[PDB]
C-alpha cells in the first residue's frame, strides 16, 4: 500500500482559493483546552491515502 499521500481530512475552517497550508496543528471540534495535543475531541491534522 503506497500510503504516502495526505488529504487534510478536516481543516480548521474553509479554504480561500489558491491557498496552501502545511500546518499540522491538532484540530479541535469540541472544547478548546487541547493545545497541540490530540485529546478526546481533538484529532490529528491530515489523513493518509490508500
Amino acid at each position: 500500500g503506497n500510503y504516502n499521500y495526505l488529504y487534510r481530512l478536516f481543516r480548521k475552517s474553509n479554504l480561500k482559493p489558491f491557498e496552501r497550508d502545511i500546518s499540522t496543528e491538532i484540530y479541535q471540534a469540541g472544547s478548546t483546552p487541547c493545545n497541540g495535543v490530540e485529546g478526546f475531541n481533538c484529532y490529528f491534522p491530515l489523513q493518509s491515502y490508500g
Epitope: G1, Y3, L9, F10, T24, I26, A29, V37, E38, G39, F40, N41, Y43, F44, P45, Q47, S48, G50
Partner: antibody
Framework: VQLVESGGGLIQPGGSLRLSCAAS????????MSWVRQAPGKGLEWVSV???????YYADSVKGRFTISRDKSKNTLYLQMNRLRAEDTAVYYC?????????????????????????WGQGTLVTVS | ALTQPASVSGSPGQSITISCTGT?????????VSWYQQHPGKAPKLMIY???NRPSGVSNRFSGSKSGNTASLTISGLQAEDEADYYC??????????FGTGTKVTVL
C-alpha cells in the same frame, strides 16, 4: 484488513522485548492503533494506544517500561517492553480503532472519535520467566 | 475499572441481560461504550459500539444500552454459538482505556 504479529516468546524478568504488528489494508497513521493483552485464561487489559500522530499514551501498569512506536515506511506497529515482570505474562493483541465514518450511519460526519475496536491481530505469547 | 458478572446462563430461545457498572467519568459521562465477543482461542469480535448501535454483519438479536453509570448488553434468542465471554469496553476518559472483567455465557 489484516494484522499479523510477531516477536513474543520466552524471556527473563528485567530484560527487553520488542513486539511487531504489521498491518495490511490500512496504516498505523490512518486510524488509532492500540495494544491490548490478555493474561492466560483471564480478562482483557488495555496496554497502550497511539493516536494517528503524536500520542504516546500507556497504562499505569506499564508506564515508564513500555513504549509504543511505528514505522510508516514498513507500515508496522511496534511495542517496546523494557524491564519485564512476572505479571506481564499474557498474549498481546494489536487492535486498530474505528476508521472515520464507521459503517457510515448517515447522520454524523467525519468526527474521528468513533471510539471502539475494529479487527484485531492474531496475538503472540509473552512469557516472562 | 469496569465490573462484570463472572458468568451468566440461560436456555435457548429467551433473552439474557448483562450488566457493567462503572464510574460517571467514562460510562456515565461519555457515550462510546462498546461490547465484544471472544471465543476460546479466537480474537475478540466487535459486538456493540456507539451504545445503541450495532455493527452490520452481526445477528440483529444483539442489543445494548446504558442507564447512567451502568451498561447493558441485552442478548435475545440465545443459540448454541453464543457460548463465549463478553467484555464491555467503555470510553477511556482521557486515553486510559478500560475493559470489564468478562461474562462467560453458558447456553443450556
Amino acid at each position: 484488513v489484516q494484522l499479523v504479529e510477531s516477536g513474543g516468546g520466552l524471556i527473563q524478568p528485567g530484560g527487553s522485548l520488542r513486539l511487531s504488528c504489521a498491518a495490511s489494508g490500512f496504516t498505523v497513521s490512518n486510524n488509532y492503533m492500540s495494544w491490548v493483552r490478555q493474561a492466560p485464561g483471564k480478562g482483557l487489559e488495555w496496554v497502550s494506544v497511539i493516536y494517528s500522530g503524536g500520542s504516546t499514551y500507556y497504562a499505569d501498569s506499564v508506564k515508564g517500561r513500555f513504549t509504543i512506536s511505528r514505522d510508516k515506511s514498513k507500515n508496522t506497529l511496534y511495542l517496546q517492553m523494557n524491564r519485564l515482570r512476572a505479571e506481564d505474562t499474557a498474549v498481546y493483541y494489536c487492535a486498530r480503532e474505528g476508521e472515520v465514518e464507521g459503517y457510515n450511519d448517515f447522520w454524523s460526519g467525519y468526527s474521528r472519535d468513533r471510539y471502539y475496536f475494529d479487527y484485531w491481530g492474531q496475538g503472540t505469547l509473552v512469557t516472562v520467566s | 475499572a469496569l465490573t462484570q458478572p463472572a458468568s451468566v446462563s440461560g436456555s435457548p430461545g429467551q433473552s439474557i441481560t448483562i450488566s457493567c457498572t462503572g464510574t460517571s467519568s467514562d460510562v456515565g459521562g461519555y457515550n462510546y461504550v462498546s461490547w465484544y465477543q471472544q471465543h476460546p482461542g479466537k480474537a475478540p469480535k466487535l459486538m456493540i459500539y456507539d451504545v445503541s448501535n450495532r455493527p452490520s454483519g452481526v445477528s440483529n438479536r444483539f442489543s445494548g444500552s446504558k442507564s447512567g453509570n451502568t451498561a447493558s448488553l441485552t442478548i435475545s434468542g440465545l443459540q448454541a454459538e453464543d457460548e463465549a465471554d463478553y467484555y464491555c469496553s467503555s470510553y477511556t476518559s482521557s486515553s486510559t482505556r478500560v475493559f470489564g472483567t468478562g461474562t462467560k455465557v453458558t447456553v443450556l
